[PDB]
Write a protein that binds this ligand. Structure first.
Ligand SMILES: CN1CN([C@@H]2O[C@H](COP(=O)(O)OP(=O)(O)OP(=O)(O)O)[C@@H](O)[C@H]2O)c2nc(N)[nH]c(=O)c21
Ligand SMILES: O=C(O)/C(Cc1ccccc1[N+](=O)[O-])=N/Nc1nc(-c2ccc(Br)cc2)cs1
Length: 185
């Protein structure tokens, strides 16, 4: 006799394939949804590792009903904690960071503040991979800095590796690299 173990939230995994020829939203696809521990692992164990995705592709894991784009009602006032990897971190760090990030999401690791969490995004880029946790209100300093502190610790980043929180509104009018930060931790 085997019962499934429900998650606190239902989650959706999305795939993105870069193509600057096409409008951004056109490049996004919903893959599938899950709401149990068992189904999370069945999906994770089945699918390609972030380290193996083609340059230009993304995975996003977002709460059911939130599309992984700035436009969504739950993101437009929000922002993201951004982890930028160097080229050598592609191997034997990207996959660890991504799984630890997924587990922060589906395990509701930020306690009461996990409610402010929208999802997480991994960008596979030749320039330097990126992982981010998206939250719903960029002006909620308490929530945002709590999530950032816990997240940085969970990933075991050295203290002197400083990570930044960008508002999506700023990002949409510049670039995630040249975007100035609202917060650091
Ligand atoms: C998250 N993005 C990204 N994006 C478009 O896609 C561009 C590239 O964003 P990105 O893929 O997140 O990062 P990256 O490829 O490393 O490029 P960059 O250095 O400009 O940040 C952005 O400059 C923006 O024009 C978006 N466009 C819309 N309409 N909604 C969105 O949510 C997003
Ligand atoms: O053109 C490609 O390269 C595409 C199709 C695509 C997708 C988005 C936008 C455009 C296009 N396109 O150009 O046709 N790849 N699709 C992929 N799906 C997965 C995938 C992985 C795990 C699970 Br579980 C299910 C699916 C990996 S790559």
């Amino acid at each position: 006799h085997y019962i499934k173990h429900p998650l606190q939230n239902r989650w959706a995994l999305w795939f993105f394939k870069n193509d600057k020829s096409k409008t951004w939203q056109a490049n996004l696809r919903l893959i599938s949804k899950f709401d149990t521990v068992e189904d999370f692992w069945a999906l994770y164990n089945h699918i390609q590792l972030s380290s193996n995705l083609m340059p230009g592709c993304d995975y996003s894991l977002f709460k059911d009903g939130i599309e992984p784009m700035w436009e969504d009602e739950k993101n437009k006032r929000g922002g993201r904690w951004l982890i930028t990897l160097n080229k050598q971190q592609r191997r034997s760090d990207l996959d660890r960071f991504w799984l630890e990030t997924l587990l922060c999401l589906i395990g509701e690791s930020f306690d009461d503040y996990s409610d402010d969490v929208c999802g997480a995004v991994v960008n596979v880029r030749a320039k330097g991979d990126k992982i981010a946790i998206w939250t719903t209100e960029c002006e909620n300093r308490e929530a945002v800095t709590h999530i950032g502190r816990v997240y940085k610790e969970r990933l075991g980043l050295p203290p002197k590796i400083v990570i930044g929180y960008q508002s999506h509104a700023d990002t949409a009018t510049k670039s995630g690299s040249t975007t100035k930060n609202r917060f650091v931790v």
